[PDB]
Specification:
homodimer; mainly beta; seven-stranded mixed sheet; globular; binds ligand KVS; aspartyl protease (chains A, B); host endosome (chains A, B); protease (chains A, B)
């Protein structure tokens, strides 16, 4: 699909058998979702935003469905105001910015 | 142009007669530029995201050239780590997210 930006580009994702809302975020290097239970061991990572840095838990090779497209990659878990799908997974679904 | 997301989608912009590099960010409601001088009166505003909130100055009716495309809208000025072009101006250049 082609998505205009008059409204926030929110989509439905499926992770860990749950449906959650997420923002398609070209301004994010990585993908971050709010606190949830994910399988496997995690590693520590620090990420920065407009207001500074936060500590998140990094999980690898997580299966996640984004607006119907399956992706398998790195997901960070932490205190983010909203679930964000970043470039790491956007490239997997073949997303591009056009104008 | 069609912009892939293997890398950060940065583009050249022209504001206040100055050339700057900016990030095309579908995850940003507004446009935030690094500390610089702009004409007119402004209002204080607080914007947030990952890491918390920061204080910016809001200037309205500012003309900005985004990668060649002239647009007009509100521009926030503050201590941002990177110049961000949000949806308020992305819509004006007809930018879309395709996948
Ligand atoms: C420095 C600012 C870079 C811009 C983006 C912003 C954004 O991710 O698009 C987020 C996503 C939405 C909320 C989480 N948008 C925002 O943060 C924007 N917020 C908003 O639009 C709304 N705010 C809220 C809280 O809803 C609006 C209501 O104000 C603001 C820019 C203000 C309009 C951002 O935070 N990117 C992080 C995402 C986290 C991540 N790791 O992917 C990033 O890539 N950080 C990189 C490097 C960033 C560049 N380097 C640096 N010097 N910090 C990193 N690896 O840590």
């Amino acid at each position: 699909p082609q998505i205009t930006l008059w409204k926030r580009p929110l989509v439905t994702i499926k992770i860990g058998g749950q449906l959650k809302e997420a923002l398609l975020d070209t301004g994010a290097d990585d993908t971050i979702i709010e606190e949830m239970s994910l399988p496997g061991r995690w590693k520590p990572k620090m990420v920065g935003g407009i207001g500074g840095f936060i500590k998140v838990r990094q999980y690898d090779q997580i299966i996640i469905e984004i607006a119907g497209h399956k992706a398998i990659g790195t997901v960070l878990v932490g205190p983010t105001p909203i679930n964000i799908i970043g470039r790491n997974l956007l490239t997997q679904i073949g997303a591009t910015l056009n104008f």
